[PDB]
Amino acid sequence: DFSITQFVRNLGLEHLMDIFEREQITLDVLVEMGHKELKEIGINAYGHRHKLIKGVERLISGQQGLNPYLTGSGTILIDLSPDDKEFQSVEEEMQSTVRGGIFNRYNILKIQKVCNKKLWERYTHRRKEVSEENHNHANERMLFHWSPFVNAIIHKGFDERHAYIGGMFGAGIYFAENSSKSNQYVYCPVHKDRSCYICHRQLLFCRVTLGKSFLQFSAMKMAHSPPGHHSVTGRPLAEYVIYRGEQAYPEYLITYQIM
Amino acid sequence: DFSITQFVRNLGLEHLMDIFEREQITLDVLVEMGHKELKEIGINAYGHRHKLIKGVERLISGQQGLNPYLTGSGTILIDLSPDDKEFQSVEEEMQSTVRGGIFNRYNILKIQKVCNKKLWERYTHRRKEVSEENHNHANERMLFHWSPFVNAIIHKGFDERHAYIGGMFGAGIYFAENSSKSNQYVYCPVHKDRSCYICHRQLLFCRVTLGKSFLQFSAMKMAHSPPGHHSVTGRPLAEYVIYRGEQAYPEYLITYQIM
Amino acid sequence: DFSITQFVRNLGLEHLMDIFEREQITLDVLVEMGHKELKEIGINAYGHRHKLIKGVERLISGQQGLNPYLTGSGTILIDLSPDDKEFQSVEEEMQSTVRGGIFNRYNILKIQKVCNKKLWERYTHRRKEVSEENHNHANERMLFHWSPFVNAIIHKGFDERHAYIGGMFGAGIYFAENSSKSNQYVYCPVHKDRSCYICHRQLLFCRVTLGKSFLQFSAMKMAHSPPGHHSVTGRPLAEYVIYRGEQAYPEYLITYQIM
Amino acid sequence: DFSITQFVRNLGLEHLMDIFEREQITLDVLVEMGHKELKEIGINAYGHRHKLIKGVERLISGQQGLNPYLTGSGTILIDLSPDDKEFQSVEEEMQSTVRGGIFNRYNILKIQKVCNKKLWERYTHRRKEVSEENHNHANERMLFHWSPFVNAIIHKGFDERHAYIGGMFGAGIYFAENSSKSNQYVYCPVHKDRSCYICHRQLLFCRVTLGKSFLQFSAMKMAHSPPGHHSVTGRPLAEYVIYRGEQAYPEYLITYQIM
Amino acid sequence: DFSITQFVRNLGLEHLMDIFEREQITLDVLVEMGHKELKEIGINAYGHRHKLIKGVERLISGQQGLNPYLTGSGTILIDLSPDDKEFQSVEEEMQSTVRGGIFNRYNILKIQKVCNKKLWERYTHRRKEVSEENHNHANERMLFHWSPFVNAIIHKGFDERHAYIGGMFGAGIYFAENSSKSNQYVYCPVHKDRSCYICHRQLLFCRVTLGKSFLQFSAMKMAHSPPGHHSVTGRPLAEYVIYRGEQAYPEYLITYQIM
Amino acid sequence: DFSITQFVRNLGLEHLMDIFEREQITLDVLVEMGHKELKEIGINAYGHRHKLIKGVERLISGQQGLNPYLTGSGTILIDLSPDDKEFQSVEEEMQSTVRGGIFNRYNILKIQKVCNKKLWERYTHRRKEVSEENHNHANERMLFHWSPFVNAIIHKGFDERHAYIGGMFGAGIYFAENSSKSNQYVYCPVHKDRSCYICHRQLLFCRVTLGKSFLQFSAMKMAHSPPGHHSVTGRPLAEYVIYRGEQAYPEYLITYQIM
Amino acid sequence: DFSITQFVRNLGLEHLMDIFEREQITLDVLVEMGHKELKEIGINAYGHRHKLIKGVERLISGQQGLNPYLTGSGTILIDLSPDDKEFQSVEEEMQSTVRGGIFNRYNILKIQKVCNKKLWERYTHRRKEVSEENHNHANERMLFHWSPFVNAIIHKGFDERHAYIGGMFGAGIYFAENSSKSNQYVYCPVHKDRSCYICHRQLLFCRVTLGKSFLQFSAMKMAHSPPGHHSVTGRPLAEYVIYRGEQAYPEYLITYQIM
Ligand SMILES: [Zn+2]
Ligand SMILES: [Zn+2]
Ligand SMILES: [Zn+2]
Ligand SMILES: [Zn+2]
Ligand SMILES: [Zn+2]
Ligand SMILES: [Zn+2]
Ligand SMILES: [Zn+2]
């Protein structure tokens, strides 16, 4: 990194750059190193470590409005083995909750676990808000979901700006307690069959914060939630609608086939 | 205490007993003091602090099977002001969820928040177990409850040994989503009137972990949950049954009158 | 309070209750007192202060999921004197920005400054999110606003669930750069005159975070912001629309008359 | 004040309002009172003082971006007696520096000392900047000045936006070392006599930071100071020009007549 | 350093010079070292640490007019990865704002982030001034900028002394909302072609405080801002002019080619 | 020290001398230690600390006429780096202000900053006197100076007893606005050439308080300043004369060669 | 102490003896402690502190004729470093004032400063008396002195009962303006040589109050000072005589050798 070269040159310690080069220390690494970490890599003199730590302070906290802290954020898909207890529980939900296609079961090919730090922080913050409003009860449920935007949810999170405008209950994000109600939404690319039996179809088994849900029995077209409520529970097979993207987390990614 | 007198006498430091007497240091206090806390109260010599700390170690860790660490645990009822948002949320649930007596609403007198450390630890541990079993979803809901043992639940927690043996779905602990379904269970002490409009009734608004619930539509006399399931959801107004005492937490205590 | 009585009784220190009574120490106060504050009120024994602090820890942190910390949050309206520089600046904006009624100026009666803590925290958190998305630029402006919910905005903040459904650019919150464009939205209660010259009108001069705005030149019915954008800028006098309530803060409350 | 009424009502201490009313405590006064100041006015319970201090903190520091701290800023003109040493020194400068009218001396009526906190802070900050640039030397001199904006300078300070556009050395602020060079700029209101011997003329004896001055000998039209320099020194009787308003302070206000 | 040798010799502690030599303690380091920092490097005797701390006090605070505290001030250019969200946002602005050359897009080679402590401090101080004047509104926008003095801005900040005297709205610093409006100002060094497709052009994406802007529609030649205003917004593609260098901060440095 | 042994022996606390020996506490150190500083070094008993503090009081204040407080006074020369802004400013003055030898520029070897506490106190006290006399204007300027006594000014300050008795304007201390006028006064030690191009000639860049200066155009032989005036400004290249040593401070020490 | 045990036992507060024992509080310490000091050491009850303070009052003030207040009085010799300014001044006097042995200079070994409180109080009281007599002029000088009683003067002050009865001007105390006249009075112990060049001779450089001195030119045998005069000045090298011991103070103690 050339950032650390300029930093060290500005401090006047450009004779430490051989050490910083051989230890592959970058600025984003040097920010989080104290006296112990700096002495481990061979900065023995106290004066040099004092200078480096003060210079890091007068960059991180001295330019807070600049936010110079530009520090590996991404999604990690942790595949589950078919003999794992979590795999069996998710499969049990996926199958037993069946109630489109002419199927009676599914062929679970793989189940993966979505792990994103930033989306988890967003979800937990909104969960805390909803909890504080709803007498310390988030009313959290695990529901299925399909939308054309699946490869993008597991990377950028749910987005209400990509809403399902043409829906029964308005421009929200639609979750189904039954896996059938969610794979009815799918679509076929290659084989023109609607009920294709060789289709590699993907489903999300998300983690939804409902809070105070508005029990609705007819159809409406809400753009946002009704006042005082955080979600919509519509029975025209119940289906749940949220209007804030940060209020659901993509928990699992299920790949399966009609069978 | 006379315990600290024996302890200090055994260590041979019986000249520190004026310090320990004026600072009201007891054994259950001395156990949790290090070098810093012991120097704050005026044990300046390093040898004395070393002796005290070693003697505490050779009592807490040296007799781990004795469990000599006998250290105040109790319920603290925190009254919620009627202008607080949590009070209004619980009241909204209490009222709007109605669907015995010839009433249409309630006269909420006071809502208190139950705070017990030990019961919370039990509940959270069982919640972790149920979560691990149920693919990391506790399936936690807030449901009402009435029982003859109300002043005992808020002090010792729910007990399945005090089960509703003569119940529709067996010997469990019965929770209702509707407040009316729960105050139908009450009983009048002073008046003979069943619908006493001046009765001080108490209701629990608990926090119940259901896990994988068994959807049951008829009556049965289960002693424990059906295999593979953590609770029973019976719709003969839905009513929920748990067969483990540690799987619910008494959250709020509502005192009210029929109105 | 009776909560502190139970707490102190559980610790076994019920002889400190005269101190806690004459100094009007409650639980919400006792939570934030350390050794120093506890000795200031006359708890001289180290054992007693240790016991109180440990008992507070084993209630605040030991039951963190309970959130037992129930601690005066509300709106404080700070009247600005007409000789103040801020009053003159807001008045200059209000007047010079005019471009309904047959008026040319206003009769500014009073300008107040809305001061809420919780709403400010919400606004600043959303500002941080929008800034991180928009290359560290919130794109913040103050714009005028009128809505039937004015005495409710200054107390509970902007709410998109109270959206202007029948608006030009959809169900958002409409802000106008011109004071006239916003006082055209008003409505007379007592007089039948639309242009009542003796009407006490209220106008909000709010602080709005636009982020990356969508320049739209026609009318559409956005339920939420267009993908990738945080607001809508409409020029059918430009008018700005946000679709998230936490993305504006009610800054000033202006009371005026047509003149 | 009503702001303090709302504040105290929010804290729940509205029974202290009689104390706050008889002692005329406002919010801008309550902000700067600690435990001892609050006990001096009769708030004896520690809990109440703790509540007030925490509430003030959660308003001053908890809304720092709001800047709710709206706290007697103005100019105080302190008249100097003619027998004072400072009056004599300023008079000696005024007279001896003569070198329009056909006069030889002045009739000094009164000399006043301008005292403003805000303008002094501005001037000292710019002085620090100029000193740091110019090897810790501000190069500060006391020079005379006349402008149509004299009753405005002593209240709002010097302003380069009110520049002398039609000047010899550009759009700056022109100061002269000789008093005659500065009273040549005056204008006659009542009498038509340009050399009116009964005119109540006002002159400023300011305090100017010249920094690194650009020695010029011909006329030019600098919009701003030349690069690397903080002022212009022109000798076409030398006259000094500054292009920053915050780089001079109105020190004395001299009223006199031609004589 | 030889300064610390004289300092320690004057205090009479010249036997500590081997410690100060092996730890590379210089005066600028010793100034910021207290009791714990001085005991870390092995100054165990209390008398010596007392002497050193007192001598540093009687040098830093005892000669405040000298400002002897001469203490890594410089610019650090932090290169952004093309896959970072901030890079994509700045590139989106750069491209989408196009409306010289015969181009339709740009070829962004690299984007760097300018980080200077002193320039940030200046910018934030002037931002606070402008905010206090303009009813707590800096009116901050990010605009593009090209000037012959680009390699000097990122190191010394904007300077109105290097103004654009030959400009349409006077001698100010010209910023453009559109990137094309700002690269129309460029100039070709090596090729005679003005529209060279192989030229490395640098553009600044600055952070400009506008405050209260004077909407002007014709041309004029202000040297400084119109009275009561902090900037000029001139629409003859709108262009913005500031007359104070401290009122914009170079946020990004964009290197690109025409494509 | 042996003074502290006598002091502690007189107090009767000679059992604390091992502590005072290991911590190298001397009398000049013990004078400045209170209760907390005495407890930090292990004087735990209140009686002993009380005795020590009272004995120190009855030694410093009880013998004020003796002035027994004999406490690191000396000059600290702080070298300036050639890339520093202050170095460049002093160099710019030194070069640009030239107008003996046949040279045109100087070769600046090194610039040092003179830091003496006592001389600064003397200079600032006389500055305050001169300011009070001259209507709160010290009329401070930085001018060059050469004298045979250069290594003595930086250590003992300017002295009018070492006056230039054979001067044009009398027995004063002659400062020059131009560096050439000041280096004409030098003298050659090694080489016989008076214009030796390899001589390390030293110069002072002082900080003089001129106050109210007497403009003289001819020669005179003043022993002291003319009545009512604090200095003499002579133009027979203007040269400034002060007749009081404490009215200038040696700010920098410039070492250079003719080039 | 045992006095404090009796005192506290008489007050009836013998349960405070552990505090008074661990804090090493003695009677001479307890006399000077008020409410603040008594609370700092852990006497929290107001009754106990009131009793202690009243008992101390009824012992110090209630028995004033007893003078029970028997409270570190002694001489503290402070050695001066040979590089100190005061050392150099005293040495300059010591050497330059020469005008027995055949020497020309001295070899100053060490100079010490005598610091006694009681002797200083005596000397200053007599100085004030003599000042009041002699129109507010003590006529104080610093003169040399040798007497067989030097180690006794520095501890008990000058004494006219040890008068030089065999003197030229009577039974007074003889001081000399020249060090030579004072070291002619010496005597050799180890070597038989009166002019022993390796003899450690001690001389006093006192601080004598002469008041109104009687100029004498012949010898006489005054037992006391002549009427109306406070001292005798004799020029038979002038020598000064005082007849009251409290009218001089032994300031420095000079140890030297003939050289
Ligand atoms: Zn297919
Ligand atoms: Zn009843
Ligand atoms: Zn009306
Ligand atoms: Zn007139
Ligand atoms: Zn090219
Ligand atoms: Zn030479
Ligand atoms: Zn001998």
PDB file of C-alpha atoms in Angstrom, chain B residues 58-166:
ATOM      1  CA  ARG B  58      -8.209 -21.994  48.367  1.00  0.00           C
ATOM      2  CA  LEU B  59     -11.836 -21.728  49.516  1.00  0.00           C
ATOM      3  CA  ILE B  60     -13.760 -20.969  46.318  1.00  0.00           C
ATOM      4  CA  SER B  61     -11.777 -23.198  43.954  1.00  0.00           C
ATOM      5  CA  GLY B  62     -10.271 -25.637  46.448  1.00  0.00           C
ATOM      6  CA  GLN B  63     -13.724 -26.814  47.559  1.00  0.00           C
ATOM      7  CA  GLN B  64     -15.631 -26.592  44.277  1.00  0.00           C
ATOM      8  CA  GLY B  65     -17.593 -29.745  45.084  1.00  0.00           C
ATOM      9  CA  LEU B  66     -18.591 -28.230  48.419  1.00  0.00           C
ATOM     10  CA  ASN B  67     -20.098 -25.240  46.584  1.00  0.00           C
ATOM     11  CA  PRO B  68     -19.197 -22.939  49.510  1.00  0.00           C
ATOM     12  CA  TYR B  69     -20.028 -19.787  47.509  1.00  0.00           C
ATOM     13  CA  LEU B  70     -23.305 -18.961  49.248  1.00  0.00           C
ATOM     14  CA  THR B  71     -24.131 -15.499  47.948  1.00  0.00           C
ATOM     15  CA  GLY B  72     -29.763 -11.281  47.097  1.00  0.00           C
ATOM     16  CA  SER B  73     -31.972 -13.235  44.689  1.00  0.00           C
ATOM     17  CA  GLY B  74     -35.639 -12.293  44.457  1.00  0.00           C
ATOM     18  CA  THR B  75     -38.354 -10.822  42.280  1.00  0.00           C
ATOM     19  CA  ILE B  76     -38.457  -7.042  41.871  1.00  0.00           C
ATOM     20  CA  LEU B  77     -41.799  -5.719  40.621  1.00  0.00           C
ATOM     21  CA  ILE B  78     -41.319  -2.491  38.662  1.00  0.00           C
ATOM     22  CA  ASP B  79     -44.510  -0.470  38.291  1.00  0.00           C
ATOM     23  CA  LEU B  80     -45.105   0.980  34.829  1.00  0.00           C
ATOM     24  CA  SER B  81     -46.523   4.490  34.702  1.00  0.00           C
ATOM     25  CA  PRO B  82     -49.730   4.795  32.630  1.00  0.00           C
ATOM     26  CA  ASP B  83     -48.052   7.448  30.452  1.00  0.00           C
ATOM     27  CA  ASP B  84     -45.222   5.088  29.471  1.00  0.00           C
ATOM     28  CA  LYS B  85     -45.263   3.584  25.992  1.00  0.00           C
ATOM     29  CA  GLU B  86     -44.836   0.019  27.272  1.00  0.00           C
ATOM     30  CA  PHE B  87     -47.893   0.422  29.507  1.00  0.00           C
ATOM     31  CA  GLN B  88     -49.937   1.584  26.527  1.00  0.00           C
ATOM     32  CA  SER B  89     -48.724  -1.307  24.361  1.00  0.00           C
ATOM     33  CA  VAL B  90     -49.655  -3.900  26.976  1.00  0.00           C
ATOM     34  CA  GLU B  91     -53.008  -2.175  27.541  1.00  0.00           C
ATOM     35  CA  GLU B  92     -53.696  -2.141  23.797  1.00  0.00           C
ATOM     36  CA  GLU B  93     -53.054  -5.877  23.645  1.00  0.00           C
ATOM     37  CA  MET B  94     -55.185  -6.465  26.748  1.00  0.00           C
ATOM     38  CA  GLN B  95     -58.175  -4.539  25.396  1.00  0.00           C
ATOM     39  CA  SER B  96     -58.104  -5.048  21.623  1.00  0.00           C
ATOM     40  CA  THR B  97     -57.474  -8.743  21.929  1.00  0.00           C
ATOM     41  CA  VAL B  98     -60.877  -9.380  23.654  1.00  0.00           C
ATOM     42  CA  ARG B  99     -63.434 -11.305  21.604  1.00  0.00           C
ATOM     43  CA  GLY B 100     -66.347 -14.871  32.447  1.00  0.00           C
ATOM     44  CA  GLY B 101     -68.478 -11.759  32.220  1.00  0.00           C
ATOM     45  CA  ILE B 102     -70.776  -9.574  30.164  1.00  0.00           C
ATOM     46  CA  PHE B 103     -68.014  -7.022  29.621  1.00  0.00           C
ATOM     47  CA  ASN B 104     -66.569  -5.426  26.503  1.00  0.00           C
ATOM     48  CA  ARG B 105     -63.407  -3.815  27.953  1.00  0.00           C
ATOM     49  CA  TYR B 106     -61.260  -3.768  31.095  1.00  0.00           C
ATOM     50  CA  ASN B 107     -60.394  -1.303  33.850  1.00  0.00           C
ATOM     51  CA  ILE B 108     -56.607  -1.605  33.999  1.00  0.00           C
ATOM     52  CA  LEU B 109     -55.469  -0.694  37.516  1.00  0.00           C
ATOM     53  CA  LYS B 110     -51.709  -1.256  37.291  1.00  0.00           C
ATOM     54  CA  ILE B 111     -49.173  -3.117  35.163  1.00  0.00           C
ATOM     55  CA  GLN B 112     -45.950  -4.329  36.756  1.00  0.00           C
ATOM     56  CA  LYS B 113     -42.830  -5.816  35.198  1.00  0.00           C
ATOM     57  CA  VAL B 114     -41.427  -8.960  36.812  1.00  0.00           C
ATOM     58  CA  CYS B 115     -37.630  -9.018  37.116  1.00  0.00           C
ATOM     59  CA  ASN B 116     -35.961 -12.205  38.355  1.00  0.00           C
ATOM     60  CA  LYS B 117     -32.404 -13.137  37.416  1.00  0.00           C
ATOM     61  CA  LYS B 118     -32.587 -16.888  38.062  1.00  0.00           C
ATOM     62  CA  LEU B 119     -35.860 -17.416  36.203  1.00  0.00           C
ATOM     63  CA  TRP B 120     -34.499 -15.420  33.276  1.00  0.00           C
ATOM     64  CA  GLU B 121     -31.413 -17.636  33.156  1.00  0.00           C
ATOM     65  CA  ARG B 122     -33.569 -20.779  33.182  1.00  0.00           C
ATOM     66  CA  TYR B 123     -35.798 -19.403  30.438  1.00  0.00           C
ATOM     67  CA  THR B 124     -32.925 -18.269  28.218  1.00  0.00           C
ATOM     68  CA  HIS B 125     -31.117 -21.606  28.575  1.00  0.00           C
ATOM     69  CA  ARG B 126     -34.222 -23.556  27.571  1.00  0.00           C
ATOM     70  CA  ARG B 127     -34.733 -21.062  24.741  1.00  0.00           C
ATOM     71  CA  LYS B 128     -31.218 -21.850  23.510  1.00  0.00           C
ATOM     72  CA  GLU B 129     -31.967 -25.583  23.601  1.00  0.00           C
ATOM     73  CA  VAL B 130     -35.264 -25.183  21.737  1.00  0.00           C
ATOM     74  CA  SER B 131     -33.562 -22.893  19.218  1.00  0.00           C
ATOM     75  CA  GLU B 132     -30.753 -25.350  18.497  1.00  0.00           C
ATOM     76  CA  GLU B 133     -33.326 -28.100  17.990  1.00  0.00           C
ATOM     77  CA  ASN B 134     -35.609 -25.930  15.818  1.00  0.00           C
ATOM     78  CA  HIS B 135     -33.065 -24.670  13.243  1.00  0.00           C
ATOM     79  CA  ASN B 136     -32.224 -21.596  15.337  1.00  0.00           C
ATOM     80  CA  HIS B 137     -35.807 -20.396  15.818  1.00  0.00           C
ATOM     81  CA  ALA B 138     -37.297 -20.364  19.310  1.00  0.00           C
ATOM     82  CA  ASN B 139     -40.800 -19.460  18.043  1.00  0.00           C
ATOM     83  CA  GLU B 140     -41.371 -17.081  20.927  1.00  0.00           C
ATOM     84  CA  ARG B 141     -44.782 -15.503  21.508  1.00  0.00           C
ATOM     85  CA  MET B 142     -46.354 -13.405  24.260  1.00  0.00           C
ATOM     86  CA  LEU B 143     -49.516 -15.010  25.628  1.00  0.00           C
ATOM     87  CA  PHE B 144     -51.820 -14.491  28.592  1.00  0.00           C
ATOM     88  CA  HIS B 145     -52.169 -16.913  31.489  1.00  0.00           C
ATOM     89  CA  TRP B 146     -54.201 -17.359  34.665  1.00  0.00           C
ATOM     90  CA  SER B 147     -53.574 -19.951  37.373  1.00  0.00           C
ATOM     91  CA  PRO B 148     -54.279 -20.331  41.103  1.00  0.00           C
ATOM     92  CA  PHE B 149     -50.495 -20.101  41.561  1.00  0.00           C
ATOM     93  CA  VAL B 150     -49.912 -16.519  40.417  1.00  0.00           C
ATOM     94  CA  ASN B 151     -48.136 -15.119  43.472  1.00  0.00           C
ATOM     95  CA  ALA B 152     -45.932 -18.229  43.259  1.00  0.00           C
ATOM     96  CA  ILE B 153     -45.039 -18.021  39.557  1.00  0.00           C
ATOM     97  CA  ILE B 154     -43.655 -14.494  39.873  1.00  0.00           C
ATOM     98  CA  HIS B 155     -41.392 -15.704  42.708  1.00  0.00           C
ATOM     99  CA  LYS B 156     -40.433 -19.266  41.726  1.00  0.00           C
ATOM    100  CA  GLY B 157     -41.293 -19.406  38.018  1.00  0.00           C
ATOM    101  CA  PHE B 158     -43.630 -21.684  36.137  1.00  0.00           C
ATOM    102  CA  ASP B 159     -43.826 -25.256  37.402  1.00  0.00           C
ATOM    103  CA  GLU B 160     -45.178 -28.127  35.322  1.00  0.00           C
ATOM    104  CA  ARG B 161     -45.551 -30.095  38.556  1.00  0.00           C
ATOM    105  CA  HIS B 162     -48.436 -27.695  39.284  1.00  0.00           C
ATOM    106  CA  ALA B 163     -50.041 -28.684  35.996  1.00  0.00           C
ATOM    107  CA  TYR B 164     -53.636 -28.241  34.842  1.00  0.00           C
ATOM    108  CA  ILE B 165     -54.251 -31.980  34.966  1.00  0.00           C
ATOM    109  CA  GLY B 166     -57.935 -31.597  34.146  1.00  0.00           C
TER     110      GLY B 166
END
